[PDB]
Amino acid sequence: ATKLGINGFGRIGRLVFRAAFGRKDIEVVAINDPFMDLNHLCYLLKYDSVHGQFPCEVTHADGFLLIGEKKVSVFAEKDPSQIPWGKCQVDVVCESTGVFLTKELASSHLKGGAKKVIMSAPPKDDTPIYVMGINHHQYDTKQLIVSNASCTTNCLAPLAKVINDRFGIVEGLMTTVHASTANQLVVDGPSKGGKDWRAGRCALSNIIPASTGAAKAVGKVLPELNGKLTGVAFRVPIGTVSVVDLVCRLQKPAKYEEVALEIKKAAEGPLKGILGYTEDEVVSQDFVHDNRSSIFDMKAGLALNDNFFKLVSWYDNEWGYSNRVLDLAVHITT
Amino acid sequence: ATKLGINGFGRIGRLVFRAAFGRKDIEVVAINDPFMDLNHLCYLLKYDSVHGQFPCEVTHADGFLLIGEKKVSVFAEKDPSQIPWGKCQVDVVCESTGVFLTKELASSHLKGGAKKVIMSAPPKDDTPIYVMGINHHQYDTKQLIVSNASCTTNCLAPLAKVINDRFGIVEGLMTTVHASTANQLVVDGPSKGGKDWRAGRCALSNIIPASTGAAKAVGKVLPELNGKLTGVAFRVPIGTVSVVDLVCRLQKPAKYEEVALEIKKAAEGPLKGILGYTEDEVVSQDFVHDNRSSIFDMKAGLALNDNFFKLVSWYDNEWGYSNRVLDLAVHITT
Amino acid sequence: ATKLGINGFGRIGRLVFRAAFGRKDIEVVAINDPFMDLNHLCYLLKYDSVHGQFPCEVTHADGFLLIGEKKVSVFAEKDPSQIPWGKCQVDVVCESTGVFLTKELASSHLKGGAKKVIMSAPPKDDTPIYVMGINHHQYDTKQLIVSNASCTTNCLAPLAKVINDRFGIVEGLMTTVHASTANQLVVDGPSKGGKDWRAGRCALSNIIPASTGAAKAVGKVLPELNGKLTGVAFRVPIGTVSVVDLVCRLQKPAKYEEVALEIKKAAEGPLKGILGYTEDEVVSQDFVHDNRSSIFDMKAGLALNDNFFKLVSWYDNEWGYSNRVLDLAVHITT
Amino acid sequence: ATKLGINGFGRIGRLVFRAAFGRKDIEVVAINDPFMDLNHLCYLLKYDSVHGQFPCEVTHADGFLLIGEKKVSVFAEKDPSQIPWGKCQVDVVCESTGVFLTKELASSHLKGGAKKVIMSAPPKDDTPIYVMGINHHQYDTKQLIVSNASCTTNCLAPLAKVINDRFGIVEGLMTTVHASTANQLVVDGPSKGGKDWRAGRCALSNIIPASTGAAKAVGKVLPELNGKLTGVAFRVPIGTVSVVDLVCRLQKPAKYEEVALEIKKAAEGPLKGILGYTEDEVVSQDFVHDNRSSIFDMKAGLALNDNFFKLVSWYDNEWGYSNRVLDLAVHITT
Ligand SMILES: NC(=O)c1ccc[n+]([C@@H]2O[C@H](COP(=O)([O-])OP(=O)(O)OC[C@H]3O[C@@H](n4cnc5c(N)ncnc54)[C@H](O)[C@@H]3O)[C@@H](O)[C@H]2O)c1
Ligand SMILES: NC(=O)c1ccc[n+]([C@@H]2O[C@H](COP(=O)([O-])OP(=O)(O)OC[C@H]3O[C@@H](n4cnc5c(N)ncnc54)[C@H](O)[C@@H]3O)[C@@H](O)[C@H]2O)c1
Ligand SMILES: NC(=O)c1ccc[n+]([C@@H]2O[C@H](COP(=O)([O-])OP(=O)(O)OC[C@H]3O[C@@H](n4cnc5c(N)ncnc54)[C@H](O)[C@@H]3O)[C@@H](O)[C@H]2O)c1
Ligand SMILES: NC(=O)c1ccc[n+]([C@@H]2O[C@H](COP(=O)([O-])OP(=O)(O)OC[C@H]3O[C@@H](n4cnc5c(N)ncnc54)[C@H](O)[C@@H]3O)[C@@H](O)[C@H]2O)c1
Ligand SMILES: NCCc1ccc(S(=O)(=O)F)cc1
Ligand SMILES: NCCc1ccc(S(=O)(=O)F)cc1
Ligand SMILES: NCCc1ccc(S(=O)(=O)F)cc1
């Protein structure tokens, strides 16, 4: 029974909390978020504009978060080293604030008594990235701090692994059309720290170009593809669910139907739960609260010729990802 | 002539700048905003998601904001006391930060050398409030710090005035359906300071109830209506333009056509430039970049009977209000 | 047991089908829609942008629609007289096309062999209107064609009944902020048959004023309130969930706490499942797939004085109403 | 001086009309649209949710559209053979209904007396396609019926020309993130003809994959690139402005800065007015009402290697394309 701590009770923190509620092998025992009192915290957990209300009565008494019989400890500590994780026997800390993305910074959780840490984002430094279904078995129990990569990487890696393993990816460029994120502004304004100016432009009415190392990070989890992938993003006014568009060149030539079939037997076989497959005329809203990392859209993508393909895959960037964080938490503890 | 300073180069500050650019009787000489480098500030001014690109060249050299052939000074102080308005010879400071809405806080501009201050919002204390066309002539030149009220008050007040003058308002309740503002969040999160929980809810997908004092404020600029008006607001995913629905009970009976005509003659007579009138089948976007405070929508409202009415008026909550801040700045100086 | 047929398999058509799947006491045996082949119809039922995927597998075979051990006849006829409801043994026809809203038009369904008809919209003629919880017990089998009113009326009528019963309503005016509907247009264009020009304006970026008879229709189902209520609507870019904002004057004086408690009594007793009550800081998304006609929002509204109040109520215009249609269909058959 | 006729007074029809209002070299003398009364037609011309109010008074009298003082003839015909283009001395008809896209259909205008015709969309047959700046000089006056291609082709073709001219495109795949169009639905519903189910899915809340021939169409205007380019689209809830994202292999190797410099040089010289260049951190709203066909975004793209590039270009799909129709009209008349 993995004891999880959550630092940053935001989109991912709260949805990680929610996904653990249906998991026996993992339970959340402690939360930290200094920008939110207990009464406020309970409101944000109870109500969700995207994923609906919490499937359970959410109360607080005596400074605890009550989910029926379960009392969850709540802290409000800006300094992550002052969070008494070890007091609640926390096995793993889900680091979902977005501002401690370095081994030096994340390791402050260790000084508070947490055994291990997962960054809910790619690292700013050289912290081991792990993607469930792709390279998680290579994790070593003495690695105390790891990254679970981005939502976009969790989407592109399974697709790329399948395409590469069978046909061999020569080179690829990715576009992701990404749902709205908390680093964006409701109206034109200054981006946090004066970096990524476009992100501070009005979210409601703009297609917004964005940099992303998610495609390039696939080379970290799948070394074979080091130097063979990169990409960009475009932000759009969408609540959740994003889509990857991979234009790739392959070694062994194929028909699009053969590419689709290979992806289908991975989805039905060794990548069940991580990689999905569909042939339906789906749109983004059809993947809200889907827990897969990548759902391949057969009819959306296409082939220019025997070696040049456009491959389309969907992902609920909040929910798919939040599940993987649990999957990783359990794995690195067990 | 009038030399304007702007504290907070946000939605209002940048549009106060833009409007002042089109005027001869007033010029902006200084700007303060510590969350904005000079490069960033130029970019935010150059491009606008709502009101299009600034209609002039926007460059910078020597730490000065250049607008064609005019230097504007730029400061980056968090403490209004530390901004050297006096050297720039500022007559009025436009206090458009949202965080210095009392006489104690706003007076540090006067310490910095500025002659007078206009709060671009309702005050949190008993600072004098003025709405152009309603009570601005009652301005006393001894008053160095004033409020230009809210945008919603500037829309409602001219409507209530004309209606009250001719028919007498017994009592009124108001709803404003309001466009998106910078206090809102793109995704569900905790609102600043843990106040106004609903406003932290996803802006893109929700109708969000909001408290507003704008209808109570009409009682301050029109004392006769003190205690007779209040209301609420609903935030909606709209870039700009909001709408007031005033349900009022009148002492003197009238037909809807008589009420409409009275507003038409005010709009074309004494309140021209402040209050507008239309009988066209208009929608919110039709009032983007409309500089009027209030635009009565004749066909949108109706009457239940000879003393019970719903009166509908539009306002560009950004642009209309921004022009008023200039009108008031000129008035309190001249 | 109750055999329902549906005409117009749109937002209301499909969600009635959906609610009915959760119900044993009512079953959908037939469907008609001429703009929608059986393959296309299955796609539109399996996937919903607002309410999520259909709660079970959806296929078709031999011209029927399979939902487990169930088979639903599907027709594609523009003329309602040519749909064989009779051969399906249909008790009630859900008339949700939008275009057969008079007895003379709707009686075409009776010529097809159906026993009774519920118009899923307010009628354009003197057709009897019923609102569940308000006047439905006044129905008698005699009348073969009825109306379930509008979503808005199903929201307002319970609120108004309770307030009128306890305090007495003198006069009332209502604004509804309404979610988007299928009569609206994506880009500016001509409204259907030149009616309601405003509805033809871009739905994504506009607050759109609109007429409604929904408040005036309360006086049919509640004769007492005839001549005492009317109102208007503002359409906005929201998928589903709408809010009613009722300004009313009461005969007996009252504090807002007394008003709230009365609504809370009704919602917990006689109007359980029709009228709801909340004290939370809710936004529109919190009511998606909420099956109640009316959810009173205590903290959203307020009183100006002892006799003048603003009362705020939410409704899922799609789902709440779709369940009311089923309640009515059962009642007129039982 | 060139006299223009408009069949179909919709987004493209009305924006072509507006685009002509300013210009001296072309003039609209007659309009035809049967699904629109004159008064309604004046309403739709006067008000625009994207491009603001018509910059001139619009009225009608005696069945003439009056702009300022100028009388424009208005018709309501389903057979263009009956529209008196000849009487109005029309040099070119802008065919912008979307349903006369063959020689057989389009040639009814010629019997009506229109000297030439431009389809405001890709043809359903082998009608000669033209794109200004690209292959327009290969037009000869014997061709009376032509096509201005799509907005997407007009964005891509300029970018494809420059890159192919200097570096040689081996293969290319394109994504366009595209603004909402008239064929979309506000809420989930059946797309017309039963064609393209995804396009009937809710436009406000979805990323919607779409087919596009616009990348394959670049082979017709540039025979050298035939069979080398294809692509897909994603529709998103945006009022106007779209972006092309072209991934391609080049024959001759290059750095991104060299490629970017080559585009800049074409934008400043031979492709000025048609192709644009920027290194600013733009968002879609910055190109609303931009009359260029393609604006290259330098910072939004990147290179994987010396031969494999992602090139990004913006376009106001409404305004740029509309001005290109007029350009083509003037060209085919002179
Ligand atoms: N939302 C997504 O689409 C998504 C997907 C994958 C990864 N991520 C990553 O997960 C991280 C969180 O993203 P989010 O979308 O949940 O953002 P969010 O803004 O919703 O959550 C961040 C939370 O952390 C809290 N916080 C800030 N500083 C803190 C500190 N000092 N101590 C404790 N709490 C603090 C904030 O109050 C906030 O609630 C980011 O790094 C993001 O890149 C997000
Ligand atoms: N936006 C509207 O429709 C509207 C209408 C009328 C009035 N107002 C009022 O105007 C005020 C500003 O609102 P806005 O919409 O421009 O918000 P905004 O966020 O766009 O502007 C606030 C600006 O102030 C700056 N700022 C914050 N703290 C500062 C400080 N310490 N010193 C200097 N600058 C600081 C920020 O960087 C930001 O640029 C608010 O009080 C608001 O209620 C808004
Ligand atoms: N959507 C709401 O919020 C809501 C709420 C309450 C009541 N209603 C009412 O219900 C009715 C339907 O509304 P909707 O939202 O489902 O609209 P909708 O457009 O989604 O559904 C209408 C359906 O009827 C079909 N149709 C058209 N002509 C037909 C005919 N000749 N025969 C059979 N089918 C035909 C269309 O193909 C379409 O699928 C309307 O009258 C509306 O006012 C809607
Ligand atoms: N707006 C864009 O993003 C865009 C860009 C490039 C090309 N196009 C193309 O332009 C064409 C027009 O598209 P739109 O966006 O203007 O759509 P729209 O719906 O806004 O305009 C179509 C107009 O034609 C009228 N019409 C329909 N049938 C008619 C008939 N038979 N006779 C006369 N008028 C008729 C309608 O009343 C309507 O006003 C389409 O073929 C489209 O593919 C659109
Ligand atoms: N509080 C905002 C934290 C945050 C939230 C989301 C992101 S991202 O996943 O969009 F890059 C980044 C940072
Ligand atoms: N930076 C946030 C400042 C702010 C504060 C309040 C508003 S309001 O107009 O919604 F009251 C707008 C902007
Ligand atoms: N397909 C159009 C059917 C329709 C859909 C919605 C409405 S209304 O509820 O907005 F009045 C009316 C008619």
XYZ file of C-alpha atoms and ligand atoms in Angstrom, chain A residues 97-98 178 181-183 235, ligand 5:
20
model
C 3.780 22.623 -8.067
C 5.832 23.153 -11.237
C -2.598 21.489 -26.566
C -2.980 25.187 -19.024
C -2.621 27.088 -15.720
C 0.480 28.999 -16.952
C -2.197 26.273 -27.383
N 0.765 27.470 -11.762
C 1.097 27.143 -13.152
C 2.079 25.979 -13.151
C 2.137 25.305 -14.517
C 1.025 24.633 -15.016
C 1.082 24.016 -16.260
C 2.262 24.075 -17.003
S 2.349 23.292 -18.570
O 2.199 21.920 -18.294
O 1.425 23.950 -19.392
F 3.760 23.537 -19.190
C 3.377 24.746 -16.503
C 3.312 25.363 -15.259
